[PDB]
């Protein structure tokens, strides 16, 4: 291998490369490695952790009160409570989720999400809610009896205080699902009990989430 | 998978500082010292401030040229003042000869010089967030065990040359291991080295008209 | 339902004064009235004990220190009370000022054993957003299901041993997400209690 001719691409500096270089301090023995607890080796394991969605993001509502969905008493049946698209990586309620931020450090992604809801009312307060999910094809349903014929989960928060709505698939390559919360029943309370509670939604990504083509963000 | 890992998330060497060897006009320095700083640009800062403790060695490349993109034969010296060595103070200074400060002698008209700085820190890993005071207001949260050194760059000359040399330091993070993930910074960066934000809070999520509109 | 932070019980660094159940007791700090207007509280990790009992003698009269903790929050709330807390332990919780003066006061970075009420809990007083605070070890306190939260925290730091009066490892934040509510004729201030129990503590460099 004594005679060589330089093929093209010489004297070039390609940033995204895994070349080698001489150590500027040979012999140096860096500080050894002790076991520090809590190492994360993948941003996927950070996405799969549930964080809050600013579902109440609205003009005027400031402070922590943007993370709360108001569920009150005099909201008649079949009325609409809240709705938010399933798009972790478009400006909306997902923009405050660990998934909604990491997905802005990449270009394409595809997987299954989940939206755990949590009721924060009195123990004596009972009722029922309808939580319906609409595939990307259709649009937001107009009535409660129009969303019951979908992929929903009726929620009796008096009995069970937290549910999960697993999104089947959400892929971003080139028109996104919608989740609506309908007042199934009324909001019934015994005497001497507050008549206005809150729902807290938490978003995440299931174990099938993937990311591709890392890129800078738009803050 | 394998593209969302922490080893790949910090790859793709980027510009960490544009230093300039001012040598003409009213700035007849002939040299310049650039304190090695990772959190120089907000884009890289916000990414590095995702973890608490991180351990990595770096490879530094210097893309130097004149101010009209021409690369003459002018010789350059890249001296790496280690963390705890006195820095030079003039074009002609004793520090430029100390054999403990490794130097790289390359010319403007040569492939950019590329060295590899090791993991230079007293503790086990770098600490971007250090709750506490060092030296057992202007000292809160300032860890001194994150200094990596200094890169002093001068044109090997005798008198003033009359040509400003712009250098673009490029750093690549290798062998990175991160610990204790943190929420990504939401507010702006009002000042460097501190987490100081501004009074007018900016909501993380954009505000729409009503809660029930898509 | 004890959230073992990062899945690591605090352990003794293999082979320093290793105290026992005399110091490994249950320090029950003062209670804090949780009101509707309440924003939150936070206590530093070893600073909350540097002036409380034996642990205040072993910390000040020494030079090196390492220990886990067993933070345990309870809310003596009624059944007609509603609300929700977010009890999270934040490793290397660094407080930030808020310029319209540039550096945090010392009372805000080492509040003592009383904690400092948040001035902007939406941003955790540290720039980072509260919505993502759940990435830290945490446990919800939802008055309709349970009013207890126990967090087991190991020793998280770069060096094996470190100072106890200068470097405060983490900070236990307690933030009400859903504010407290009640009809007329109830205890207008739900009390919040915090219990601490150093686990596998060590010390060195006497006096």
């Amino acid at each position: 291998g004594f005679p060589t001719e330089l093929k093209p691409g010489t004297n070039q500096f390609l940033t995204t490369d895994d070349g080698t270089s001489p150590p500027i301090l040979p012999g140096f023995e860096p500080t050894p490695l002790i076991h520090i607890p809590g190492e994360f080796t993948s941003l996927l394991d950070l996405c799969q952790v549930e964080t809050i969605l600013e579902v109440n993001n609205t003009t005027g509502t400031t402070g922590v009160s943007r993370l709360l969905i108001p569920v009150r008493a005099q909201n008649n049946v079949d009325q609409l409570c809240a709705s938010f698209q399933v798009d972790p990586g478009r400006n909306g309620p997902w923009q405050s989720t660990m998934v909604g931020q990491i997905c802005r450090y990449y270009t394409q992604w595809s997987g299954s999400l989940k939206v755990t809801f949590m009721f924060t009312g009195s123990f004596m307060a009972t009722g029922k809610m309808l939580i319906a999910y609409t595939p990307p094809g259709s649009a937001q349903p107009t009535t409660r009896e129009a969303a019951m014929l979908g992929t929903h989960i009726v929620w009796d928060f008096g009995l069970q205080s937290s549910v999960t709505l697993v999104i089947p698939w959400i892929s971003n390559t080139h028109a996104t699902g919608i989740v609506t919360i309908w007042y199934q029943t009324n909001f019934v309370v015994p005497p001497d009990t507050p008549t206005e509670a809150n729902i807290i939604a938490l978003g995440a990504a299931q174990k099938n989430f993937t990311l591709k083509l890392c890129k800078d963000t738009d803050e | 998978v394998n593209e969302a890992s922490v080893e790949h998330f910090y790859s793709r060497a980027g510009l960490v500082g544009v230093v300039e060897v001012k040598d003409s006009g009213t700035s007849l320095d002939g040299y310049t010292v650039w304190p090695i700083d990772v959190m120089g640009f907000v884009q890289q800062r916000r990414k590095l401030e995702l973890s608490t403790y991180m351990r990595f060695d770096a490879e530094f490349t210097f893309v130097s040229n004149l101010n009209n993109s021409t690369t003459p034969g002018m010789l350059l010296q890249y001296m790496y003042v280690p963390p705890g060595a006195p820095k030079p103070d003039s074009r002609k200074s004793y520090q430029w000869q100390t054999a403990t400060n490794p130097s790289v002698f390359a010319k403007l008209s040569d492939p950019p010089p590329q060295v590899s700085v090791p993991f230079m820190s007293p503790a086990t890993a770098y600490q971007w967030f250090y709750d506490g005071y060092p030296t057992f207001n202007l000292q809160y949260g300032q860890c001194p065990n994150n200094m990596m050194g200094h890169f002093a760059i001068r044109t090997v000359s005798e008198s003033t040359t009359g040509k400003n040399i712009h250098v673009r330091v490029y750093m690549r993070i290798k062998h990175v291991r991160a610990w204790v993930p943190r929420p990504l910074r939401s507010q702006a960066y009002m000042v460097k080295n501190y987490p100081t934000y501004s009074q007018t809070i900016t909501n993380t999520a954009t505000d729409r008209a009503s809660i029930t509109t898509t | 339902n004890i959230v073992l932070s990062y899945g690591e019980w605090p352990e003794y660094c293999p082979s320093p004064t290793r105290p026992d159940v005399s110091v490994n007791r249950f320090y029950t700090l003062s209670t804090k009235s949780w009101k509707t207007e309440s924003t939150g509280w936070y206590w530093k990790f070893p600073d909350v004990l540097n002036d409380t009992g034996v642990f205040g003698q072993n910390a000040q009269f020494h030079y090196l220190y390492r220990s886990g903790f067993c933070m345990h929050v309870q809310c003596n709330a009624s059944k007609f009370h509603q609300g929700a807390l977010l009890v999270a332990a934040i490793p290397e919780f660094v407080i930030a000022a808020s310029s319209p003066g540039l550096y945090p006061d010392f009372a805000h970075t080492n509040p003592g054993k009383d904690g400092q009420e948040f001035r902007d809990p939406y941003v955790l007083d540290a720039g980072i957003p509260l919505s993502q605070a759940l990435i830290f070890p945490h446990q919800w306190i939802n008055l309709r299901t349970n009013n207890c939260a126990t967090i087991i925290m190991p020793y998280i730091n770069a060096l094996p041993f470190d100072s106890a009066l200068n470097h405060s490892n983490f900070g236990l934040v307690v933030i009400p997400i859903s504010p407290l509510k009640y009809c007329n004729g109830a205890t207008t201030e739900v009390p919040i209690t915090l219990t601490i129990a150093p686990l596998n503590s060590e010390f060195s460099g006497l006096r």
């Epitope: 609205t58 003009t59 005027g60 509502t61 400031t62 402070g63 922590v64 009160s65 709360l68 108001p70 009150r72 206005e196 809150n198 | 505000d207 008209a209 009503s210 809660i211 | 009101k35 509707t36 207007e37 309440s38 859903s178 504010p179 407290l180 509510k181 009640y182 009809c183 007329n184 004729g185 109830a186 207008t188």
Partner: antibody, heavy 120, light 106 residues
Framework: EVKLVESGGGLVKPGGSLKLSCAAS????????MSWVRQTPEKRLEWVAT????????YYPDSVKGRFTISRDNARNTLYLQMSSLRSEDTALYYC?????????????????WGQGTSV | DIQMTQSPSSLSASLGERVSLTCRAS??????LNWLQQEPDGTIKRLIY???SLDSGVPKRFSGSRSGSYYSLTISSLESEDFVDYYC?????????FGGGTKLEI
């Protein structure tokens, strides 16, 4: 019912002090964030001052911003509002009602029930 | 302040007519605009909250609506006990300003 009643007003020389009471009952006056609204002689209701749900926070509009001093007894079920050195064009029927930018679970009772309004 | 103001300073309709009082906001105030009804001499009651929902006791003749920057209130058929003052209040702009008046006549 949310029974609020304002009282303690009347004439006063320009420059001095004249408090105002909004003692209310029939509802939990320990969780609601109240506020003060002024109805000038021109029949234009302008915001006067507010108070948090525990008497710790306060937003003062450009009307006083340093002159009026609101408070909250919260134990005798009363609401205070100072008129320190009131201006010349400051006569109004100072109403008091609920509603406040604090109390995160707000934006629902924003001046839901009102008082009666005492003149000055 | 956002300075949401009502256009009709004074209107007059019949006992079977359908009045339409507006309140044109300047900046983005969202769905945080209320309507406060004031007696000739008494206190000021509430009609609409969040621009759409009636209160717990208000009749069916009243109803709110939203249209861009033209938040408005429309009474069904203008029954008795209606020829009183009207106000529009928003709590988005932190100064919390008000409008003018819509004292109805006949």
């Amino acid at each position: 019912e949310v029974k609020l009643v304002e009282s303690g007003g009347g004439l006063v020389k320009p420059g001095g002090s004249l408090k105002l009471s909004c003692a209310a009952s029939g509802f939990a006056f320990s969780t609601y964030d109240m506020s003060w609204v002024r109805q000038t002689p021109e029949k234009r209701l302008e915001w006067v001052a507010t108070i948090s749900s525990g008497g710790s926070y306060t937003y003062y509009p450009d009307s006083v911003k340093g002159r009026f001093t609101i408070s909250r007894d919260n134990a005798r079920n009363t609401l205070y509002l100072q008129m320190s050195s009131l201006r010349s064009e400051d006569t109004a029927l100072y109403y008091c009602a609920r509603g406040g930018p604090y109390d995160y679970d707000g934006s629902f009772y924003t001046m839901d029930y009102w008082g009666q309004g005492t003149s000055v | 302040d956002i300075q949401m103001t009502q256009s009709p300073s004074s209107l007059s309709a019949s006992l079977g007519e359908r009045v339409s009082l507006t309140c044109r906001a300047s900046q983005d105030i969202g769905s945080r605009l209320n309507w406060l009804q004031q007696e000739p001499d008494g206190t000021i009651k509430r009609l609409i909250y969040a621009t759409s929902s009636l209160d717990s006791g208000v009749p069916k003749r009243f109803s709110g609506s939203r249209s861009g920057s033209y938040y408005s209130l429309t009474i069904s058929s203008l029954e008795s006990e209606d020829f009183v003052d009207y106000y529009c209040l928003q709590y988005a702009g932190f100064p919390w300003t008000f409008g003018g008046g819509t004292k109805l006549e006949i």
